[PDB]
Amino acid sequence: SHSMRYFYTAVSRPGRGEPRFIAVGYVDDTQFVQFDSDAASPRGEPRAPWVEQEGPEYWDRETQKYKRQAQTDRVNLRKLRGYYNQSEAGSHTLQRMYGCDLGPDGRLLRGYNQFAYDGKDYIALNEDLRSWTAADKAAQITQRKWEAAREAEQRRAYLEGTCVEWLRRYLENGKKTLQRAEHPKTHVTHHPVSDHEATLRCWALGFYPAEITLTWQRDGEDQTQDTELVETRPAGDGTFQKWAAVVVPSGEEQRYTCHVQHEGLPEPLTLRW
């Protein structure tokens, strides 16, 4: 399955500067664009080679979209502070995420367009792409305004049409890397804690996409409550890393097995110390 996803963050900064607006866009786990209103002369900027060779009309139009959105979010931050009767002294955050998911058959599975204020759900476009869910009384004001303005029809046209068209264009132009799977490189390390126990750590390195499952078993039984799992983390080169650890009694290492599932593996892997 493939997705195109946009992430907007708007932050008010009383006393320090004008509000910040930063946008990033992704296809699957690969970023392709950034816009930051704090930059010297803010423009849409490429982050993937398969958007670097778009022409000037493409980049000029994306830049103008972002400039419009930054102004809209400056107004939105002021509107929300009024809705909630918040002090002008505080810094607040408005986030928006939207995009389109294609299912494994290549057809549109889901469009979404949702907002959070100060880290809490505010309003979201429902899966029918026609109605809204408001999280609180302030967001019901926005819901009435957007129902009156027929906002959902505009968003639906993007999410079902324009969004999918962009995603398909990028999947073709960036095919060499977006359609790739990089299997995890796997190994186990061993770390004595004391004379009586040691941690076994199972590693997955250099994989793409980021989705992965790492599990420890002991005589074929999952060690769910005993396993420490770090968050999947970017290597910095477009690939990802993860590890899973268990603390085992000294001399019982051979009862433990690590199990790795990933899109780039034909069969799940089994590792032993």
Binding site: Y6, A23, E62, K65, R68, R96, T142, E151, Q154
Partner: peptide
């Protein structure tokens, strides 16, 4: 490409 038509004002 970003969602640019209209103005999504809260």
């Amino acid at each position: 490409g970003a969602d640019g038509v209209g103005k999504s004002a809260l």
